[PDB]
Design a protein around this ligand. Structure first.
Ligand code: IFK
Ligand code: IFK
Lengths: 9, 237, 237, 9
């Protein structure tokens, strides 16, 4: 969920 | 009448939705084009993947979300992504043709198109009935935007940790929703109950989709048509 | 003169290449469109991902490949994918404009486009020099197709197990190559040595790309622009 | 490499 993480800043 | 905090929450949700939803459907020209075997799968996967990005932008602007732990934010987003998307897509659903009409012939997604994305009638039947049911409710923007944030802040989702804190946040959007409908929506003595009924429908549609998506993701020839974001959000990690 | 087995190998490679390469560049209309921040990254990632599919179709038709273990086939493909693609892309490189011209303004990939896909000049400088160097060689289809299969069957790649068996297969495409050039290519007393020199260049370009790709893949905002196939082939699993 | 696997039939 690293993409999600980066999208969640 | 409504309170200051209750209208601040409304102003924020409405603004976030306007920052994350495009009534012109411009960016659709950037997707893998539609084809009408699963011809439509690349374009629709691009559509979903895009929508997930916009849902995350919405979610980040819901009051209280940004202060959850990163795990709880992920937990909520993984479980509720497809529902929020089913919710926002109502803004493009048309009752005249029973299709989503995001522009001209190409981006007019009818029933035969959705089946060419690898999904069966078991999902399509109640999804459309949910859409026209939602369309008939004739929601105000505030109710629509509140429904999305109430759905997203459901603590009855797998992976959530601080379920009392997010139940607290959810329990208060519902307050803003009940207050909005009473003060500001004429002829809505029944509307809130009907909106909360739609949340239950979405749980059912959620399970039917993720069941059919599990089948796509297990076939590499189809999962390779997906995007990393899709595979991350809808995956089992 | 050439032997029966040696021309069977030639007929097979030429046919496989014709089954896996499209001089019309038709399927480019199915990619995410080009945009000219890394604007070009989605379209070029779609281009690479497509090319990987065609390389696998080529590789499956090389005599002897299908009988390697599945691990060795994967090992060879992961390590040599970018080289074979750099090799086949020469068929679209134009010396007049120093660009790949896969059709009209949109699919005419020049230098500024490649930099808008997140790659620096350290890759671009020797890649172009490699292309015009390859273009000047004026290869026959048989040599081109043989070079691709010789490159793919290199046993000096990480992950290979049966390196004596694939060195055997490689050691014999080279025989077909040397024999072809002698019998059938006039004025080619130096050509084979020059082609084998290009294999060394590709090792260098391979390392420069995978170094810059590691940087893209570690930034989720860019890796999400990639395709599953790309991430699988170029990943570290 | 399951995608690759399936592509390698
Ligand atoms: C910006 C907007 C606009 O209102 C348009 C809009 C429409 C949304 C629709 C209608 C078309 C079909 C899908 C995409 C559906 C929303 C979700 C249910 C079914 C969708 C399909 C079958 C997914 C298949 C791909 C995977 C592999 C993820 O299963 C999305 C919204 O965000
Ligand atoms: C069908 C054909 C036609 O001949 C056209 C053809 C051209 C090939 C080119 C020129 C354009 C640039 C790339 C794609 C390059 C081939 C590989 C080197 C650089 C490429 C780029 C920078 C990759 C960036 C994406 C990742 C993330 C993988 O780094 C491919 C071939 O298969």
């Amino acid at each position: 969920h690293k993409i999600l993480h980066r999208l969640l800043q | 009448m409504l309170s200051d905090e209750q209208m601040q929450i409304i102003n924020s949700l409405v603004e976030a939705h306007h920052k994350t939803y495009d009534d012109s459907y411009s960016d659709f020209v950037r997707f893998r084009p539609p084809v009408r075997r699963l011809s439509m799968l690349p374009h629709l996967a691009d559509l979903v993947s895009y929508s997930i990005q916009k849902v995350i932008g919405f979610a980040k602007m819901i009051p209280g979300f940004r202060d959850l732990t990163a795990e709880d934010q992920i937990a909520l987003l993984k479980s509720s992504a497809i529902e929020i998307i089913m919710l926002r897509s109502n803004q493009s659903f048309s009752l005249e043709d029973m299709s989503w009409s995001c522009g001209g012939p190409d981006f007019k997604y009818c029933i035969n198109d959705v089946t060419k994305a690898g999904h069966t009638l078991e999902l399509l039947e109640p999804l459309v009935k949910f859409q026209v049911g939602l369309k008939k409710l004739k929601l105000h923007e505030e109710e629509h935007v509140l429904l999305m944030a109430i759905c997203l802040l459901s603590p009855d989702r797998p992976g959530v940790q601080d379920h009392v804190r997010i139940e607290a946040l959810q329990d208060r959007l519902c307050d803003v929703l009940q207050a909005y409908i009473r003060i500001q929506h004429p002829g809505g003595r029944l509307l809130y109950a009907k909106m909360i009924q739609k949340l239950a429908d979405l749980r059912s549609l959620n399970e039917e989709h993720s069941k059919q998506y599990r089948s796509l993701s297990f076939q590499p020839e189809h999962s390779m048509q997906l995007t990393p974001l899709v595979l991350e959000v809808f995956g089992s990690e």
